[PDB]
């Protein structure tokens, strides 16, 4: 999983 | 003060060091929604290549502006509530 997909779950 | 329509819509004024971080990746204003702050933080981490290339939920930030604001050398993106509390210490809630 990309960092971009992990962070997208915050907002 | 009106209650924000969602948590993401809470209006905030970053404190000076967080504001400096946001401006370093192109932010232009003094007041933001929580959603905007999170997008700019994500952009900061990607442009500075702070994430572990193989295990991309790990961020390394020792002595970076980001590590100074959060008070840690590294953290996991999976720790949602820890990340929110670190961010909250670095801003003030404002009207609307």
Swiss-Prot record, chain B:
Region feature Necessary for interaction with USP2, mapped onto this chain: 1-94
UniProt-annotated location(s): Nucleus, Nucleoplasm; Cytoplasm; Nucleus, Nucleolus; Nucleus
Post-translational modification as stated in the protein's UniProt record: Phosphorylated at multiple sites near the RING domain by ATM upon DNA damage; this promotes its ubiquitination and degradation, preventing p53/TP53 degradation. Autoubiquitination leads to proteasomal degradation; resulting in p53/TP53 activation it may be regulated by SFN. Also ubiquitinated by TRIM13. ATM-phosphorylated MDM2 is ubiquitinated by the SCF(FBXO31) complex in response to genotoxic stress, promoting its degradation and p53/TP53-mediated DNA damage response. Deubiquitinated by USP2 leads to its accumulation and increases deubiquitination and degradation of p53/TP53. Deubiquitinated by USP7 leading to its stabilization.
Tissues where this protein is expressed: Ubiquitous. Isoform Mdm2-A, isoform Mdm2-B, isoform Mdm2-C, isoform Mdm2-D, isoform Mdm2-E, isoform Mdm2-F and isoform Mdm2-G are observed in a range of cancers but absent in normal tissues.
Location of the region described as Sufficient to promote the mitochondrial pathway of apoptosis in the Swiss-Prot/TrEMBL record: 1-85
Domain SWIB/MDM2: 10-93
Record's note on what induces expression: By DNA damage.
Top-level lineage group: Eukaryota
Function (record text): E3 ubiquitin-protein ligase that mediates ubiquitination of p53/TP53, leading to its degradation by the proteasome. Inhibits p53/TP53- and p73/TP73-mediated cell cycle arrest and apoptosis by binding its transcriptional activation domain. Also acts as a ubiquitin ligase E3 toward itself and ARRB1. Permits the nuclear export of p53/TP53. Promotes proteasome-dependent ubiquitin-independent degradation of retinoblastoma RB1 protein. Inhibits DAXX-mediated apoptosis by inducing its ubiquitination and degradation. Component of the TRIM28/KAP1-MDM2-p53/TP53 complex involved in stabilizing p53/TP53.
Comment, domains: Region I is sufficient for binding p53 and inhibiting its G1 arrest and apoptosis functions. It also binds p73 and E2F1. Region II contains most of a central acidic region required for interaction with ribosomal protein L5 and a putative C4-type zinc finger. The RING finger domain which coordinates two molecules of zinc interacts specifically with RNA whether or not zinc is present and mediates the heterooligomerization with MDM4. It is also essential for its ubiquitin ligase E3 activity toward p53 and itself.
Record's subunit section: Interacts with p53/TP53, TP73/p73, RBL5 and RP11. Binds specifically to RNA. Can interact with RB1, E1A-associated protein EP300 and the E2F1 transcription factor. Forms a ternary complex with p53/TP53 and WWOX. Interacts with CDKN2AIP, RFWD3, USP7, PYHIN1, and RBBP6. Interacts with ARRB1 and ARRB2. Interacts with PSMA3. Found in a trimeric complex with MDM2, MDM4 and USP2. Interacts with USP2 (via N-terminus and C-terminus). Interacts with MDM4. Part of a complex with MDM2, DAXX, RASSF1 and USP7. Part of a complex with DAXX, MDM2 and USP7. Interacts directly with DAXX and USP7. (Microbial infection) Interacts with herpes virus 8 protein v-IRF4.
Note: MDM2 RING finger mutations that failed to ubiquitinate p53 in vitro did not target p53 for degradation when expressed in cells.
Disease linkage: Seems to be amplified in certain tumors (including soft tissue sarcomas, osteosarcomas and gliomas). A higher frequency of splice variants lacking p53 binding domain sequences was found in late-stage and high-grade ovarian and bladder carcinomas. Four of the splice variants show loss of p53 binding.
Family: Belongs to the MDM2/MDM4 family.
Protein's UniProt name: E3 ubiquitin-protein ligase Mdm2
Source species: Homo sapiens
Included stretch of the parent chain: 17 to 112 of 491
